[PDB]
Subunit: 443 residues, 4 copies
Amino acid sequence: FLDYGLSEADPDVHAIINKEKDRQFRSLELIASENFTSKAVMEAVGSCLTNKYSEGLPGKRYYGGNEHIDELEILCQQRALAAFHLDGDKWGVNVQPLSGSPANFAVYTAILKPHDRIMGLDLPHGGHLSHGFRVSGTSIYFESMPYRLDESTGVIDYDMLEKTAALFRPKLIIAGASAYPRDIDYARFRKIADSVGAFLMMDMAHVSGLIAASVLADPFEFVDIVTTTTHKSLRGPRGGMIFFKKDAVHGVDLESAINNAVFPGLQGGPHNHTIGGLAVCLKYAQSPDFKNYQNQVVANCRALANRLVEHEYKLVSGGSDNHLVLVDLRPSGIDGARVEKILDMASITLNKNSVPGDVPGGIRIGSPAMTTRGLGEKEFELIADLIHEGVRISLEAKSLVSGTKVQDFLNFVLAPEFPLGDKVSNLRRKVEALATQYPIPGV
Amino acid sequence: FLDYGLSEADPDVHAIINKEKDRQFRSLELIASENFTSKAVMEAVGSCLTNKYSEGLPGKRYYGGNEHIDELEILCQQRALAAFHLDGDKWGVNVQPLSGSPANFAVYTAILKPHDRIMGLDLPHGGHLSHGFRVSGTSIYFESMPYRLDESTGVIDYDMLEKTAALFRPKLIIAGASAYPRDIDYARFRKIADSVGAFLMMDMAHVSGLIAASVLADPFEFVDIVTTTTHKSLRGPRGGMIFFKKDAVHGVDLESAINNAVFPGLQGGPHNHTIGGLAVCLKYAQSPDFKNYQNQVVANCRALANRLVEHEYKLVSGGSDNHLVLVDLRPSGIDGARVEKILDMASITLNKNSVPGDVPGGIRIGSPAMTTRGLGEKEFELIADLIHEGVRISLEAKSLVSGTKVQDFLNFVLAPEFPLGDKVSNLRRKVEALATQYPIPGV
Amino acid sequence: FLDYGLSEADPDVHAIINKEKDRQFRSLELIASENFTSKAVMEAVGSCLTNKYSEGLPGKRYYGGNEHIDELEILCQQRALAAFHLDGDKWGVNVQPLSGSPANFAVYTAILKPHDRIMGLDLPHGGHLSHGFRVSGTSIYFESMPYRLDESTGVIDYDMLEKTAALFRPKLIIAGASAYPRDIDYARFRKIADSVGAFLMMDMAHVSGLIAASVLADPFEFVDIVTTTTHKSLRGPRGGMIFFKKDAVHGVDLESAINNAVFPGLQGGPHNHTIGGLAVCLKYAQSPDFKNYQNQVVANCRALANRLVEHEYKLVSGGSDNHLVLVDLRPSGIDGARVEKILDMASITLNKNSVPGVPGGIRIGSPAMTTRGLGEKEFELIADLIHEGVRISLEAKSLVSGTKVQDFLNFVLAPEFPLGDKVSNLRRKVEALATQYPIPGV
Amino acid sequence: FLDYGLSEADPDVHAIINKEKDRQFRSLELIASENFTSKAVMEAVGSCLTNKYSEGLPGKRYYGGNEHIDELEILCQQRALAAFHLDGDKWGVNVQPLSGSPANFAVYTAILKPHDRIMGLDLPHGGHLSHGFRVSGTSIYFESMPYRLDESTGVIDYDMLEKTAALFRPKLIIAGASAYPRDIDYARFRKIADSVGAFLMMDMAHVSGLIAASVLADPFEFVDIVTTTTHKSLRGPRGGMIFFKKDAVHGVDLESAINNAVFPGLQGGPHNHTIGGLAVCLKYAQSPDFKNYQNQVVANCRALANRLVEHEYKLVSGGSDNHLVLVDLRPSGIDGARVEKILDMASITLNKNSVPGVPGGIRIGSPAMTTRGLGEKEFELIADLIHEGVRISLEAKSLVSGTKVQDFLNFVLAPEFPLGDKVSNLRRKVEALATQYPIPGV
């Protein structure tokens, strides 16, 4: 009977959310996997759509009362196809996966038997866990072998992939990556997949919006299946999708196989509130404004990358074609673990990241979140300068601490006696003075 | 830059959500897996918590900027333990699983190797897909064998489980079920698990709130691991949890194993907005009001069950100890598929369901959703009467249609010429006159 | 360069063979799995057939020079079909498996995927390791679940097998057993297999000769596939065979699959010397004398069973339909391992065996001594000699303080051993029976 | 009841053995995998050892009556250790495997779980089926990936193996090969295995005699486990052995694991007759005459290799370090299957073999004819006879219109066959060499 609002029911959680909102506002959020979703997405996600149970697909449901839920899921499917410029006679989409990892695992389950062979980009070389690392589900239930970047160039070693694929004979080759700063040679992937009769998939989670806006090459010209999250580059809620060819691929009806793998294979009832949010975000993904945003994402990342290399940083692969840079900190005399911490103390949020030639040696930096807030190229050049000051503080601290462990560094910088506190505060002040000039979307 | 509300950005989706809200309001929602969550849960779920990326656990994260996210997840953990009256020195909880199915699959991944042996309640006998049916993930990656209800009684055949477990030698035995209307003999489960050295798990998704309020027996006195959804009986957002013993169980550190299985095993970054919602709902789960609600859930289901059996329906297992009844329609001369459809046309939402002795022969009916709205025992007796009128319409229609297929029935009842339309409308009018007397929670 | 006989080339090996020859002559060999093969089988096995490498099948060899090997292999196949009264348009046979376990494992490899489900008779209830039964390779690479004997009747619990198969859904059900003293209800097995869509196989290793001689029921009326060893009741060399229907079964061409599973799947070149000896024994398996022998095997076992019952021993299932009995020694106050050792010291050679409920039983078989010419009256005498052996075993057990079977072994092996004179006296009786009878062999 | 000799009991089998004996005498047997075993081995194999059921290990048997079988099995083990110059505190050996493939499969079963990763030499690059290499059982139950020969040098591409193993992470790397004409760089294999934490095994089936005689390098200095057949270069009966370190390796007690994998894992009762013959051959493998024989094997192969090069044939890797050559016939304008058949019709028995790049090659080995007493000069004559055979094969191919190898087989098998006189003339030369030489055997 009692139906209180959040501030009425639970002031501790309301206070935490407000603090998180305010932290987001005050900080340079440079995590490449983050974005700020819109008020409309949040309202859709925070709605009574959460209440409906609806196993199965539209028109073929396992519970009553699904008229409107079916209209929504159909709408969401249609908008997903339109956003990626897909003919619905050639492609279908499943919009129920709960996230990017389950989306991938549904594909594996759909087209592979257990212990079938998969190749994906190696985790230290920029790939994602769900492509194989036995640490990952992918590696537990299937037989994965990585392909790697050239350690000397930071570019995918296509010739070595071609030789290793002929020996290992994968049934699936996954393109796509977490921390790969360059565009993929999809034709080369297709050639290599065909050389062994493999399925070819793209996990476009990190670049989906850039693909939708035609800033990057289109994997849909070459691959059989495309998976994605919906919250990064797309600016949507936390969800996942799987796109598939409708024509049979190596004698497999991918539509049935994938649908069956999502439900009843791995999931129960879909999260309709999320599907609502998704529908909202895919409408916006078709717009000229979204296309402009994505060009600005890439322009901002380039302005950042250029200013970083003026400060003498090394960038894995020499630069970026997309929304992220991977900085190799080792030639500047430090690692990503130490740097990440100091930057975070100064309200610059990003992540340490392994670089080729393995504590991780790099940091990953992305432009989408702050681009959403309205920062342009000039502001991204200032971000680079601020990151530079933070790396200089980190080098000074690494020098001053006596212990040589990462944990010794941590203890040193988090101690109340920390002698560089004033430099951190001073950097934090400038970080917040930049970030707080810009609005932040959301309810 | 553009940050419109939902009605501003996307009137088609706003209109669908409103329609869904209004359908929920007008209908008797009797799906046992559904509930109406509170305004506070929705506000937490529809918040900027969705924007944060936070791989790992509190205090041990893989990205910067997680001060408040960590405070929230710790809070959520603490409230989960308090809601189930658990000592934190004996139990831990992981609150990141994306739903009930992934939660189960994380447990399997944590404590089993591929092809290890699992026993769970058979799907036609009331179990859930994720316990094994090769249709399910559980059955694809592991070796499942069902245990069954007595087809003659509708009660779990404990003696046959005990004999079959000695022969099959499961490494895991799962208690818990989708459509089991009685309480579980947990001591007997423990005895049987010990007889073969198996792990013992309870999937309490369908009864979690009843367990929290001490209406049913406590699986935590007997089992090693407990999984659950958060949206059914608990009245929370769409999520999942896994509870585990902290003492080693058959030489396994369940805490590390389960945490590792959730991430990096099966999932990426947690859905913090959902964790927010969850925290909210677990606060309310500790309250006297929640305890009263759960006693009313069970009282309402009993009033419904008693009125149904006065109309001469057969109930699987003879009745119910909980929030649901499973009606065996075969002795009344009809199946669940036909009945479900007519009821749904009259705004009574439930689901067809297999009954023991296999189109499915039953319907499953639950009290939580309408109990939340404020219906008492008298109103549930009226619900039974309304269901009875719908079953009578369904029998009349089954008689009048010429084709003997379920699809022939469907075509007949959905046709504009449908000769019993006036009886359906008349029943629908009375259904809506009941439901629209009560408020509905949410934003 | 110099091609000496064995006694000249290697007197130590020659000596050991001389000892074993003598041991065989002096003992009562009652291992149900043993027999005495013929001079003719041994001559083929010890021939120049051992020199030829012949991977593939008759007329499709990976090596040259196999004209005569192909001839032999086909002859061997036609004699296997004839020995079991099989129409060649309905049944085929692969005579390449090296033994029984590899024969079985080749069938699994042929018709199953890894981790597919198999049921067979539980190991303590008379099963073989390579069946339903992680100890065995069958349980390692596949998912096995046992079915058991009804412990109160000592018969296969077909009612419980029907129920458990319905839940477990095996892809393959295996009948046949090492220590099952009754015939198999094949129709009931077929009914059960068909209820789950399973392949049905009989492993007839222990009873193959009795099937060939129509003393027991014919698994070929009902099953899809039959495996066997060639050395036990068939009295051939050590090898294996796989029989299979030639009509497709559950969509599988069993011929193609089984042939590919044996080679290149699990083996290389066949053992052509073995195949030579196998052909010899399969010719003999068609003779009236072989049918007479097999009838005597069963009658000898019945004579022994009945006399052991007169001595108040409990037989699993109350007797036997075949060549073996399984004695439950627990009611007599001792296990099978202690008894096996004492009997062995008095030249009565059998084996400890699990019974329904250290092993509680011994398994006793008639084929080997029936080959040598013993009749029913001699088998009653064998039962008396066994009984005396069991009494000495009981007596030796009471002299032992430690309850560990290793302590017993140590006690009885010691040169001091205080019941040595009882054992010698028994041994004298045992040898005085045995040494009246010829022994086949080179 | 009546124990006749083979010629009386079964004249048809006797006849076939007579034919094969004659075939062996008249032919040049050049299958690298064949040899001619001794009269003494054959006498042990054709003995009463075949009658004994002996599951378990020396002194821990599941059956009674194995006093003398235990004696033999231990003798056989000590002679295997001695034949390969092994300290018994560091190495153990299991002499029960029935053949080479089961030996290998027992090792996998012992130290690996199902779907664990294995690398071995690719089948078209000279590997054996039971290795790295779904065709083989090794590839069915485990996850195999091949390593290959550098196609421009015909040597193992160790640089590419080092890279691919780093990515694939095999739990087991297998050295050894059916058709590899050079010695193995064991130190480099050890280095590679250690880089991924792999077990390292050598399958020495093709070269075991040459290792025993120290003609090739010793895999025992570097590997964890060695498997072998007993019939090829060892000149024993058909069987297998597994050698293993007794110190723990990557946390595994290899002795316990391997013994359990052979029995009860994959086999039943051992073949004691085979073990008898194995003991005989292992005694001979320690003699100076065996070392002299093995040196002659290699010299004969070198004499043949060099003469084939004078005839402008391409040998894979440009020659050989061992008992075999692998001829790439593609530059000469024909495949190995056509050539194998023609050579076989002229009593030159070898096998078609894949080469790097229908099989393009033939494999030729010296052991069998060196056993009979041929020297270097005779092996040069063999190369000349092969050359003539290849010319007739080319000529017969031009008379054939269809490009299918089955059409060729049909052409040459036909009684009309118009090059019959060329083949007879060659055959006369081949037999006139062969029939000057004795043949060992009973």
